[PDB]
Amino acid sequence: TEFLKPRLVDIEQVSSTHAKVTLEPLERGFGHTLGNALRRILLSSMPGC
Amino acid sequence: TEFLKPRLVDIEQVSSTHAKVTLEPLERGFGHTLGNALRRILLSSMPGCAVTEVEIDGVLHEYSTKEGVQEDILEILLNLKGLAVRVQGKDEVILTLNKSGIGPVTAADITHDGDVEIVKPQHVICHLTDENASISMRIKVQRGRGYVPASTRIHSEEDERPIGRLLVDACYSPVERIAYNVEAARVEQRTDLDKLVIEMETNGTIDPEEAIRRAATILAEQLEAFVDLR
Amino acid sequence: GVLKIVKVYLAVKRRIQPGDKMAGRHGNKGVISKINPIEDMPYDENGTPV
């Protein structure tokens, strides 16, 4: 295991509603692994009213 | 927040290679969420052991032919890429193989180190045809992860360049096949909650339970960057 | 004019990569564009990847 961790690089808060977030570096294939897993929770699982 | 964690339920080890792992209960939609994310790490990131270096005496290069041997040196190397080995203590071990006589050389003919387990002893390595033929080689096994080719390894270190050491592909990664199925759980009266049955097919050794632990570990380590750093 | 000649024979192991040309036997040509990681390959219900 040579654990290569990413670091939150840029948070471009274009608006309080819209925000872009760059993230690097991610080991090969972890881009989509983390990308999708997060997208799913963010859409179906984030709770509210 | 109606937080609900799954627990490792059943580890059905159908074979040392093949294992089913059922997982419940998972909240609705987390089945595919965890299922796929795990499958991706399990295929790539997983660490294992593989033959990195080979040294047969009376062999200058991999393209030559050895006398009294059916297989060309390349064929032999390809067999060592598929050799299933577990190293318990050290990350790097050099095993010695001296064998003679009219015999299909198997993995058991390698002198086993105290902390080195040959998982498939019947694994074929070479066929000795002449009885007077004797083969002697030193197989270097290293522990690593993923696929490290000899072409990416012949353009980095190379401080010592000994004429006789042969570099070949070694897919360290143990996981051969993985698929995650989602079926009904029928727990209390929840119904929607299903179960995560992950069918793994790996080479020798790497233990099913141990592998799942490591895969989830790598995932949670990456999530540190999105929790801790905002 | 030629007193002696030395011939060296080199061997090279070449693996497939983008830009190599591949084809079937029905006159279907193609150039490899990308080598995809096994995780990304479309896979069937049984788990076996293309």
UniProtKB/Swiss-Prot annotation, chain B:
Keywords of this entry: Acetylation, ADP-ribosylation, DNA-directed RNA polymerase, Nucleotidyltransferase, Transcription, Transferase
Coiled-coil parts of chain: none
Q: What is one Gene Ontology biological process annotated in the Swiss-Prot or TrEMBL record?
A: regulation of DNA-templated transcription initiation
Chain intervals for the UniProt region annotation (Alpha N-terminal domain (alpha-NTD)) = 1-230
Q: Which GO terms describe its cellular component?
A: cytoplasm; cytosol; cytosolic DNA-directed RNA polymerase complex; membrane; transcription elongation factor complex
Q: Does the keyword Nucleotidyltransferase apply?
A: yes
Instruction: List the catalysed reactions.
Output: RNA(n) + a ribonucleoside 5'-triphosphate = RNA(n+1) + diphosphate
On modification after translation, the UniProt record reads: (Microbial infection) ADP-ribosylated on both alpha subunits by the phage T4 protein ModA. ADP-ribosylated on only one of the alpha subunits by the phage T4 protein Alt.
Q: Where is this region: Required for interaction with Crp at class II promoters?
A: 157-160
Q: Listed disulfide bonds for this chain?
A: none
Q: Which GO terms describe its molecular function?
A: DNA binding; DNA-directed RNA polymerase activity; protein dimerization activity
Its EC number(s): 2.7.7.6
Indicate the family of this protein: Belongs to the RNA polymerase alpha chain family.
Role of this protein: DNA-dependent RNA polymerase (RNAP) catalyzes the transcription of DNA into RNA using the four ribonucleoside triphosphates as substrates. This subunit plays an important role in subunit assembly since its dimerization is the first step in the sequential assembly of subunits to form the holoenzyme. Part of the processive rRNA transcription and antitermination complex (rrnTAC). The complex forms an RNA-chaperone ring around the RNA exit tunnel of RNAP. It supports rapid transcription and antitermination of rRNA operons, cotranscriptional rRNA folding, and annealing of distal rRNA regions to allow correct ribosome biogenesis.
Q: Present the record's domain note.
A: The N-terminal domain is essential for RNAP assembly and basal transcription, whereas the C-terminal domain is involved in interaction with transcriptional regulators (such as CRP) and with upstream promoter elements.
Describe its assembly.
Homodimer. The RNAP catalytic core consists of 2 alpha, 1 beta, 1 beta' and 1 omega subunit. When a sigma factor is associated with the core the holoenzyme is formed, which can initiate transcription. Both the N- and C-terminus interact with different regions of transcriptional regulator CRP. The rRNA transcription and antitermination complex (rrnTAC) consists of RNAP, NusA, NusB, NusE (rpsJ), NusG, SubB, ribosomal protein S4, DNA and precursor rRNA; S4 is more flexible than other subunits.
Q: What is this protein called?
A: DNA-directed RNA polymerase subunit alpha
**Taxonomic lineage from the root:** Bacteria, Pseudomonadati, Pseudomonadota, Gammaproteobacteria, Enterobacterales
Q: Which gene encodes it?
A: rpoA
Summarize which stretch of the complete protein this chain spans: 6 to 235 of 329
Swiss-Prot record, chain C:
Q: What is this protein called?
A: DNA-directed RNA polymerase subunit beta
Q: Quote the subunit structure annotation.
A: The RNAP catalytic core consists of 2 alpha, 1 beta, 1 beta' and 1 omega subunit. When a sigma factor is associated with the core the holoenzyme is formed, which can initiate transcription.
What is the documented function of this protein?
Answer: DNA-dependent RNA polymerase catalyzes the transcription of DNA into RNA using the four ribonucleoside triphosphates as substrates.
Instruction: Give the shown range, full length included.
Output: 1045 to 1094 of 1342
- Please name the source species: Escherichia coli O157:H7
What the record says about family reads: Belongs to the RNA polymerase beta chain family.
Lineage, uppermost ranks: Bacteria, Pseudomonadati, Pseudomonadota, Gammaproteobacteria, Enterobacterales
